Design a protein around this ligand. Structure first.
Ligand SMILES: CCCCCCCCCCCCCCCCCC(=O)OC[C@H](COP(=O)([O-])OCC(O)COP(=O)([O-])OC[C@@H](COC(=O)CCCCCCCCCCCCCCCCC)OC(=O)CCCCCCCCCCCCCCCCC)OC(=O)CCCCCCCCCCCCCCCCC
Ligand SMILES: CCCCCCCC/C=C\CCCCCCCC(=O)OC[C@H](COP(=O)(O)OCCN)OC(=O)CCCCCCC/C=C\CCCCCCCC
Ligand code: HEM
Ligand code: HEM
Ligand code: HEM
Ligand code: HEM
Ligand SMILES: CC(/C=C/[C@@]1(C)[C@H](C)CCC(=O)[C@@H]1C)=C\Cc1c(O)c(Cl)c(C)c(C=O)c1O
Ligand SMILES: CC(/C=C/[C@@]1(C)[C@H](C)CCC(=O)[C@@H]1C)=C\Cc1c(O)c(Cl)c(C)c(C=O)c1O
Ligand SMILES: CC(/C=C/[C@@]1(C)[C@H](C)CCC(=O)[C@@H]1C)=C\Cc1c(O)c(Cl)c(C)c(C=O)c1O
Lengths: 55, 271, 101, 442, 422, 49, 59, 54
């Protein structure tokens, strides 16, 4: 079986297997931070968007 | 990383379409004339063209139906974006991230957390500062003012520009003095991204150790930076000429130069 | 006329991969042939090429380079993979041609 | 040069004795040689109650005759350095001897004394009873066999061909002296036998010895009549014998074949050459010309696989058999059908050229010894009617090309309902419906 | 059109033999016979002979791993390598029109191997397999151990690479083994379905490598050991032997006849083999199933001889012992002047038949044309056979009961006897 | 042993044309398939509409 | 024998099978449409404007 | 490799969750509601948008 509930759980195994135990090159520069920012924007846009759609 | 890339390009196009229709919702002067020109683009497609415009509008000239099916469309796309983003990131994961030197980093990987989670939190608080400094202190700095004037079906504002992020294309569209050519050039101005992976000749992956590609690369950036300026100016000399140039310049640096200097560089390394 | 030499040596210092201690061959992007070639490298030549690289990455994360003294020199760059790779690409062209026949 | 050495080989002479027996041979300057009688009678000829007679007989054809009991028979053969041995299939039995060209005539008499005067001592019958019942316990642990039987068993289910050559357990436990007798009587008959021999022997001197010991007489028309067997029906089905405790799994897939007569059998064999066969010890490895062998090597698909074109009088079986681990049966099966479909749709001229040369060589290795040449002659008359020369075979094999292979494989393979036999830990391979759909669209 | 040629047989200045024979078959079969083998191995390079046998499809200075297989396959050809503790035989076989094609590779494989480090080490796991399939026949399990007990060196070397050495062989060991053994003086380029003027032109104009004996095998000392392998397996296989005769020696024919006199494997399917002393003798002793025969091996500087028994674990005792008395009784005049006349034919027969198959024939011409650069006629070999007296036979039978004995056995040996009880 | 194993009787289910153990099932194949593939071809035409 | 003629010419080749479904869907439509409309109009004689129509038309 | 049905990061999904999916051979018609429920969702969503546009 799987000891920790981070590597076995059908869901957390995902949050963990794609953003926490994910293998990343040790030398990625600031130019690699745009991925997340793009991601963050999406969530921020979507949120502020709904709020507006409600008016 | 072809698939990660191609889904990217798809993302870009989707974000563009989204931001466009959003900009139409407040139904201001740009809102309207933008809606009119962009949907009119299909009119360049022979036959099924003039019809394609009819759906787009839902009538025989921009009006209410266009505005409601646009709000629907805007409401929807973002999610499709979020959806595809998941795939983008999934294809990625097959290979792993690339790195500046462009040589395998298997000999040295690290756990995303806390290395990059912290680095991204920081990268966030940095972008966030000017974004908020801008939005709070100078709200309209980045946006066209025509949209403060309720749409007028009879008057096209004389200073009609698109939102800053589309200028560069608007610039190219205004280069080719032919309906279909301009349209094709416009399409290609973004769709050309699909060809990049295939126009790679260097035996190395990045430009870190390619000084000639670098210069060409930065020459290209300044190249777009110009088209943007051009897109924000009237269709009069000297602009018109400078315009056609930057465009011609854009497509050459990408389809002809890069792949050429690339090959050249290979020979200088003795490969 | 030592022109090509003059140029090559120039481009070599221009690239600057030597500032990290990498041989011209440590920078090759790993496509299919390169990957095969590397599997044919003798144990030691492979373990050295690995360190060179793991060391260059560590430099890059730190945002530094080697002290001028340790930089590889245009004439002391050992093309350790070049000959293997050429055979891999030659074995491949044979197959490719032989399957069209 | 090839072309010529082919036409030089001495023609095979044929002459029939008025009792129906046919004599034939190929004369060489070989000091030694082989002679045997090839009887067209097997298990397909057996009914449900006598299943395993042709086999219970093959066991006693060497334990002595009436003229000379056990020790006298064996001793008389051994002491002259001859080799007596034979076999029995679904529809073709045979007994042949290998010996010095000098004993050519003394042999013929021996052969004839087994096919006519088999002793059948009932002391021996209660011994060969326990012996066969034993050989079935051995043969049962031979996957390759357990599988081809099960293949027929379901491919021709409900008919004669669907029977094993060894027969049932109940039959062997109860078959009586009477039945074996009656089997020999009804089947071992002159018109249905063929005395074939090759090596350093005189066709004449052979035919003489024949007239002398191979003397049975024919009065009515019945005796000179060669019965025609009731046709066997091919059924697209499957039989799955599962046992996850066996080390590897065995799988066999086939469609109905044309049958000896049809010229297409040539093309089909060329086809089978393109796919060929493979097994764990082939040195060639990843470079083998057989696309399937390559994939097999590349992905570790199997331990071995083989194409096969088994022919019979009126029917046949055209397919393939592979052995693999439980966890790779699927992919193998997948790649396999894949290669069949390529046959029906996109075979090239390069593939066929090689296919032909590979066949030609297998065709010559067919005749590498006196026993083999004698086996060819025995089975050619009995099945193809006459004798088919290498020079001829070769002409037919050269006539084949791409278009031909495609048109023919499409004829017998495309969209057909195949017969499947799986033995072992076969869970990964599944659903007939699926395997069925693998029969169309490359 | 075609008829009868002559078995010609040249021998160039360097010691390379060329034995041809045009028999007009529609197929040729060329073959390079060499005096190499697992006996030239040392404790240091063990199994290097075995691997050299599998390394036949590897890239050579003239042809590539890929093109050798695809090249031979293209003409329905075939490549194969058979070897004994002291004899390797590389040989192709194609249709007459492709002798040239299949030759290049045969020449390239035996004379210009590269043994590239990678190819080589990617191949070494095959020794693991090849040796596992072969070792499925307990028959080959007791022979390994036999030769081990029967000797102290050279011939005592296993035919299949021992385990501990799997994956520890180098390209050097391969190279050095080829440079010091595949020397033109130890090589014979035979051939069938070919005209001598060609097979010759090739061997000369193309063949090369070093000449002269090179390294020589350390004469096989005799040991007389006893290796028992307890392993459960219900059937106990056993082989008891003693120094036999060498190849070509006089005392050989005698054993070959003492072989067929005691019984050398049935001649009648499901037979009882009456003409087999040993068989009949064992039968009159045990009740259950079994088999027993006359073992005879002829090596360059030595040989083996004795019997081999396959019996149930319980009746192993009686079967093996009964197998002995039956050999002593034959050492004490128990041989009829007739048993000797029949055994003489069975032997002329076996030989005469074994040469019908192209393989067996080329292997007849070869072996001889390599161990003497000659060729006895099938008429001269016939004389040597019957020139054996009823004495010679009874003598070989004695030499066995007297000499020191070796033994190998594997199965549930619980009921099998130790050499010091026979 | 595998010799005592036989394929049960599927007469209760066989199509009329391949019920007789002595007739080449091959003749009636073209039909048995043409019919079942015609049902499908129609379903496709019905859905296509 | 149509089933055989059909199978051999239409249903075998997975490419011709498609052409059949298209070519067929076309015919099936044009006919199934008239028929149904024909059935429906008939079931409602003199109630549809198609019928009344002539009373206020022209001629 | 071999088939592009089991390797492809996407098709390996259409295939690994609805085509090579291990299903009990005896599920009754009461198991058909899963898909009908699914189909509804897509049908509802589609007809819904069409309406949202007016
Ligand atoms: C605070 C910024 C760091 C200042 C600096 O240049 O460091 C030099 C120096 C560190 O020297 P270093 O270790 O050799 O520098 C390596 C890294 O560049 C040291 O930097 P780092 O690796 O620790 O930090 C990386 C950081 C660095 O931030 C910047 O480059 C700015 O970049 C990011 O995190 C990416 C976010 C980008 C967001 C921009 C949003 C786009 C909107 C455009 C309008 O810091 C100081 O001199 C001390 C200042 C206190
Ligand atoms: C399209 C319309 C977009 C509108 C125009 C926006 C342009 C904004 C102004 C330019 C911003 C760029 C900032 C300059 C940064 C200078 C810098 O750091 O350069 C050096 C630095 C070091 O190189 P290395 O060899 O990897 O170092 C490791 C070994 N020591 O280079 C880099 O940071 C790598 C390049 C980063 C990419 C930035 C390019 C700017 C964006 C332009 C978009 C271009 C693509 C085309 C889009 C089509 C739609
Ligand atoms: C919705 C839009 C997008 C989002 C939210 C997004 C998100 C991501 C994320 C989070 C990463 C990982 C971190 C990183 O390396 O930056 C990434 C990587 C990547 N994205 Fe995007 N991306 C988007 C658009 C695009 C576009 C437009 C392209 C293509 C023109 C693209 C190309 C790539 C590539 C090539 C990678 C691999 C980067 C590497 O080499 O390390 N992405 N993206
Ligand atoms: C892809 C992320 C998004 C982008 C790029 C985006 C972009 C835009 C743009 C450019 C405008 C015009 C803004 C202006 O200048 O007035 C806008 C407005 C709007 N968007 Fe979005 N939007 C996104 C997501 C959303 C979503 C999902 C919703 C709601 C669920 C939403 C609802 C609206 C509404 C109601 C308006 C019109 C009123 C206004 O302008 O304030 N947006 N959007
Ligand atoms: C959006 C609503 C739903 C959809 C589209 C949906 C869909 C599915 C699908 C497709 C399956 C597989 C096939 C089947 O067994 O039916 C499934 C199984 C199942 N669903 Fe749902 N479901 C929904 C709601 C629910 C609800 C409301 C419950 C619980 C009160 C439920 C309980 C289950 C369970 C227990 C299974 C396993 C069925 C089994 O034992 O075979 N589902 N569902
Ligand atoms: C969970 C699936 C859905 C359900 C259960 C559902 C259900 C309903 C219900 C009960 C109504 C009232 C119908 C009536 O007039 O009696 C309705 C109306 C409507 N729905 Fe949905 N809906 C679904 C999805 C959607 C979505 C996603 C959209 C559009 C993208 C949509 C747009 C509308 C609109 C515009 C109406 C109001 C006008 C009308 O009734 O025709 N619906 N929906
Ligand atoms: C979208 C994101 C991170 C998001 C947040 C939301 C975390 C889940 C928690 C803390 C934060 O606030 C981050 C911004 C990261 C995207 C992302 C990736 O997907 C991948 Cl494969 C890599 C290799 C990187 C490397 O830098 C990355 O940044
Ligand atoms: C930049 C552009 C179009 C961009 C699209 C059409 C891409 C070519 C494909 C993906 C998209 O959805 C974009 C909106 C058109 C130029 C353009 C505009 O954008 C806008 Cl707002 C206006 C008012 C005009 C007026 O003349 C214009 O010519
Ligand atoms: C939603 C669906 C199937 C949908 C369609 C849409 C296919 C993707 C193609 C053909 C169709 O028309 C189906 C209705 C199946 C749901 C579904 C499942 O998710 C799962 Cl885990 C199981 C075990 C079953 C068993 O019956 C099932 O029906």
């Amino acid at each position: 079986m799987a000891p920790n509930i981070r590597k076995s759980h059908p869901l957390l195994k995902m949050i963990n297997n794609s953003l926490i135990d994910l293998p990343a090159p040790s030398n990625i520069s600031a130019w690699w931070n745009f991925g997340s920012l793009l991601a963050v924007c999406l969530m921020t846009q979507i949120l502020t968007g709904l709020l507006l759609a409600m008016h | 990383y072809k698939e990660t890339w191609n889904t990217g390009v798809i993302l870009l196009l989707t974000l563009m379409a989204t931001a466009f229709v959003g900009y139409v919702l407040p139904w201001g002067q740009m809102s309207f004339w933008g809606a009119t020109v962009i949907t009119n683009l299909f009119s360049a497609i022979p036959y099924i063209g003039h019809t394609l415009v009819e759906w787009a509008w839902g009538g025989f000239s921009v009006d209410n139906p266009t505005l409601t099916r646009f709000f629907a469309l805007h409401f929807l796309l973002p999610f499709a974006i979020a959806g595809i983003t998941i795939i983008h990131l999934t294809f990625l994961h097959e290979s792993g991230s690339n790195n500046p030197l462009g040589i395998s980093s298997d000999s040295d990987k690290i756990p995303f957390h806390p290395y990059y989670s912290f680095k991204d939190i920081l990268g966030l608080t940095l972008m966030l500062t000017p974004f908020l400094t801008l939005a709070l202190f100078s709200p309209n700095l980045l946006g066209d003012p025509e949209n403060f004037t309720p749409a007028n079906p009879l008057v096209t504002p004389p200073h009609i520009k698109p939102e800053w992020y589309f200028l560069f294309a608007y610039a190219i569209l205004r280069s080719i003095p032919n309906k279909l050519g301009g349209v094709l050039a416009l399409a290609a101005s973004v769709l050309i991204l699909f060809l990049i992976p295939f126009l790679h000749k260097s035996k190395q992956r990045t430009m870190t150790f390619r000084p000639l590609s670098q210069t060409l690369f930065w020459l290209l950036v300044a190249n777009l930076l110009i088209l943007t300026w051009i897109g924000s100016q009237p269709v009069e000399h000297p602009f018109i000429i400078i315009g056609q140039m930057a465009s011609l310049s854009y497509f050459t640096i990408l389809l002809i130069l890069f792949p050429t200097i690339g090959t050249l560089e290979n020979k200088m390394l003795n490969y | 006329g030592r022109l090509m030499d003059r140029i090559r040596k120039w481009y070599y210092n221009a690239a600057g991969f030597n500032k990290y201690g990498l041989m011209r061959d440590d920078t090759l992007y790993e496509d299919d042939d390169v990957k095969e070639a590397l599997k044919r490298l003798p144990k030691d030549l492979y373990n050295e090429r690995m360190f060179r690289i793991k060391r260059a990455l560590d430099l890059s994360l730190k945002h530094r380079i080697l002290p001028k003294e340790q930089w590889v020199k245009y004439e002391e760059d050992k093309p350790y993979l070049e000959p293997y790779l050429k055979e891999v690409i030659r074995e491949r062209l044979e197959r490719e041609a032989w399957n069209k026949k | 040069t090839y072309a010529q050495t082919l036409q030089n080989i001495p023609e095979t002479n044929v002459t029939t004795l008025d009792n129906g027996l046919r004599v034939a041979s190929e004369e060489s300057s070989q000091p030694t040689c082989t002679v045997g009688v090839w009887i067209g009678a097997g298990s397909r000829y057996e009914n449900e109650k006598n299943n395993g007679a042709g086999y219970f007989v093959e066991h006693l054809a060497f334990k002595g005759t009436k003229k000379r009991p056990c020790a006298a028979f064996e001793k008389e053969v051994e002491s002259m350095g001859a080799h007596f041995n034979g076999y029995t299939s679904r529809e073709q039995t045979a007994f042949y001897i290998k010996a010095l060209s000098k004993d050519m005539p003394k042999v013929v008499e021996l052969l004839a004394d087994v096919v006519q005067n088999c002793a059948l001592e009932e002391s021996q019958i209660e011994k060969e009873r326990g012996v066969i019942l034993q050989e079935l316990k051995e043969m049962d642990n031979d996957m390759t066999n357990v599988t081809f039987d099960y293949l027929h068993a379901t491919a021709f289910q409900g008919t004669a061909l669907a029977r094993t050559v060894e027969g049932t357990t109940e039959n062997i436990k109860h078959l009586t002296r009477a039945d074996l007798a009656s089997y020999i009587d009804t089947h071992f008959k002159a018109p249905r036998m063929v005395l074939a021999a090759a090596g350093g022997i005189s066709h004449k001197e052979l035919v003489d010895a024949a007239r002398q010991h191979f003397s049975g007489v024919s009065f009515t028309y019945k005796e000179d009549a060669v019965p025609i067997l009731p046709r066997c029906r091919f059924t697209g089905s499957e039989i799955r014998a599962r046992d996850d405790a066996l080390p590897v799994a065995h799988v066999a897939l086939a469609v109905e074949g044309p049958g000896w007569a049809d010229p297409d059998n040539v093309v089909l064999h060329v086809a089978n050459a393109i796919i060929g066969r493979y097994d764990r010890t082939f040195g060639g490895g990843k470079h083998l010309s057989s696309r399937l062998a390559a994939l097999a090597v590349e992905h570790k698909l199997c331990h071995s696989f083989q194409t096969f074109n088994t022919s019979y009088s009126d029917t046949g079986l055209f397919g393939f058999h592979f052995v693999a681990d439980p966890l790779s049966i699927d992919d193998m099966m997948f790649c396999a059908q894949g290669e069949w479909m390529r046959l029906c749709t996109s075979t090239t001229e390069s593939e066929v050229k090689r296919a032909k040369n590979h066949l030609r060589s297998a065709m010559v290795a067919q005749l590498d010894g006196t026993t083999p040449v004698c086996e060819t002659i025995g089975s050619h008359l009995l099945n193809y009617g006459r004798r088919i020369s290498l020079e001829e075979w070769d002409s037919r094999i050269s006539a084949v090309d791409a278009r031909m292979v495609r048109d023919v494989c499409s004829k017998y393979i495309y969209d057909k309902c195949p017969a499947l036999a799986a033995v072992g830990p076969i869970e990964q391979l599944l659903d007939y419906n699926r395997i069925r759909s693998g029969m169309y669209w490359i | 059109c075609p008829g009868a040629e002559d078995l010609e047989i040249t021998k160039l200045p360097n010691g390379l033999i060329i034995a041809s024979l045009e028999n007009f078959s529609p197929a040729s079969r060329i073959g390079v016979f060499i005096k190499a083998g697992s006996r030239y191995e040392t404790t240091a390079n063990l199994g290097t002979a075995h691997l050299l046998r599998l390394a036949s499809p590897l890239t050579t200075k003239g042809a590539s791993s890929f093109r050798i297989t695809r090249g031979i396959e293209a003409v329905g050809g075939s490549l194969s390598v058979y070897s004994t503790r002291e004899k390797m035989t590389y040989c192709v076989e194609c249709l007459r029109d492709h002798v040239d094609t299949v030759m290049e590779y045969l020449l390239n494989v035996t004379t210009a191997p590269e043994f590239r480090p990678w190819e080589v080490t990617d191949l070494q796991p095959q020794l693991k397999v090849d040796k596992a399939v072969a070792f499925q026949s307990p028959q080959v399990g007791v022979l390994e151990n036999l030769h081990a007990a029967a000797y102290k060196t050279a011939l005592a070397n296993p035919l299949y690479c021992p385990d501990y050495r799997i994956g520890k062989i180098t390209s050097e060991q391969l190279h050095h083994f080829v440079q010091n053994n595949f020397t033109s003086a130890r090589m014979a380029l035979v051939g069938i379905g070919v005209k001598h003027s060609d097979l010759k032109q090739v061997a000369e104009q193309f063949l090369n490598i070093r000449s002269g004996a090179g390294t020589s095998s350390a004469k096989a000392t005799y040991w007389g050991g006893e290796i028992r392998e307890q392993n459960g397996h219900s059937l106990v296989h056993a082989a008891v032997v003693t120094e036999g005769a060498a190849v070509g020696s006089a005392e050989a024919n005698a054993f070959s006849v003492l072989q067929h006199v005691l019984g050398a494997g049935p001649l009648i399917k499901r037979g009882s083999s009456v003409t087999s002393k040993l068989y009949q003798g064992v039968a009159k002793a045990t009740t259950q199933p079994f088999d027993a025969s006359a073992f005879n091996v002829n090596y360059s500087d030595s040989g083996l001889f004795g019997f081999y028994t396959i019996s149930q674990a319980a009746h192993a005792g009686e079967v093996i012992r009964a197998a002995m008395n039956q050999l002593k009784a034959a050492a004490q005049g128990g041989v009829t002047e007739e048993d000797v006349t029949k055994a003489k034919n069975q032997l002329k027969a076996t030989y005469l038949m074994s040469v019908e198959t192209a393989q067996g024939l080329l292997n007849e011409i070869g072996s001889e044309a390599l161990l003497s650069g000659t060729h006895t006629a099938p008429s001269v070999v016939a004389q040597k056979i019957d020139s054996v007296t009823s004495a010679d036979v009874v003598n070989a039978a004695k030499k066995f009961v007297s000499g020191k004995k070796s033994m190998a056995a594997s199965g549930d040996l619980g009921s099998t006897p130790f050499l010091d009880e026979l | 042993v595998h010799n005592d194993v036989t394929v049960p009787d599927f007469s209760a289910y066989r199509r009329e044309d391949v019920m007789d153990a002595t007739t080449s099932s091959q003749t009636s194949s073209e039909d048995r398939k043409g019919f079942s593939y015609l049902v499908t071809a129609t379903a496709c035409v019905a859905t296509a509409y | 024998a149509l089933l055989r003629q059909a199978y051999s010419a239409l249903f075998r080749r997975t490419s011709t099978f498609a052409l059949t479904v298209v070519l067929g869907a076309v015919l099936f439509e044009r006919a199934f449409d008239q028929g149904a409309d024909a059935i429906f109009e008939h079931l409602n004689e003199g109630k549809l404007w198609k019928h009344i129509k002539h009373k206020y038309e022209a001629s």
